[PDB]
Amino acid sequence: PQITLWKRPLVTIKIGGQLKEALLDTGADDTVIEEMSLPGRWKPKMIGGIGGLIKVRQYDQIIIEIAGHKAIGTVLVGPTPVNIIGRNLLTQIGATLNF
Amino acid sequence: PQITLWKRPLVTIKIGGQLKEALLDTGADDTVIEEMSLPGRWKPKMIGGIGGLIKVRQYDQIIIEIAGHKAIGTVLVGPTPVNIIGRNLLTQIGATLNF
Numbered sequence: 001p002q003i004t005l006w007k008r009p010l011v012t013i014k015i016g017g018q019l020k021e022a023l024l025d026t027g028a029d030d031t032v033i034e035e036m037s038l039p040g041r042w043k044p045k046m047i048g049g050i051g052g053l054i055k056v057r058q059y060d061q062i063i064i065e066i067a068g069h070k071a072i073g074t075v076l077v078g079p080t081p082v083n084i085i086g087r088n089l090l091t092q093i094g095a096t097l098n099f
Numbered sequence: 100p101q102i103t104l105w106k107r108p109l110v111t112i113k114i115g116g117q118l119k120e121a122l123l124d125t126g127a128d129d130t131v132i133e134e135m136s137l138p139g140r141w142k143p144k145m146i147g148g149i150g151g152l153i154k155v156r157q158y159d160q161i162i163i164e165i166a167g168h169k170a171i172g173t174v175l176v177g178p179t180p181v182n183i184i185g186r187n188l189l190t191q192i193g194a195t196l197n198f
Binding site: 001002003004005006008009023024025026027028029048050066067069084087090091093094095096097098099 | 100101102103104105107108122123124125126127128147149165166168183186189190192193194195196197198
């Protein structure tokens with residue numbers, strides 16, 4: 001699609017067979033999704049969050065659909081207030097900033 | 100321009116007659132720029148930062164050039180580690196996310 005920025009650029013994603021709302025964030029290097037049911041192995045990581053650090057599970061090679069576009073990449077799963085799609089996955093769907 | 104996201108989307112901005120590097124961030128509502136010389140009146144605000152809150156000066160009706168495109172809007176000036184161009188100014192230069 002072509003998304004203007006008058007409102008937050010929120011889209012529907014599909015991950016672990018579940019639909020969620022997520023923010024397309026060009027200022028984020030990585031993707032962080034709220035706690036959820038996923039199968040498979042993961043590695044513990046900590047990242048910055050509101051209030052301080054948060055504990056996440058790093059899942060590699062996750063299939064995610066972002067506004068109907070399928071992508072493979074790493075997803076950090078933990079207690080974030082906003083689902084964030086960062087550049088690691090925006091690059092996989094060919095997303096560009098245009099002006 | 101059309102900016103891909105393999106690297107951070109850093110561009111040159113011009114503000115208060117000074118060139119700076121800034122991150123184009125669709126996940127940011129507002130624009131935050133490092134401490135600098137500016138003329139004019141301002142209002143004190145606090146926002147979230149790395150480590151905790153930070154103190155900023157809110158300047159309204161600031162002219163800023165973003166990769167050669169001129170925009171008018173509000174800028175928060177304070178001790179940020181990264182200059183961030185948020186949606187308040189991305190909308191003014193007609194920026195879209197495209198995929």
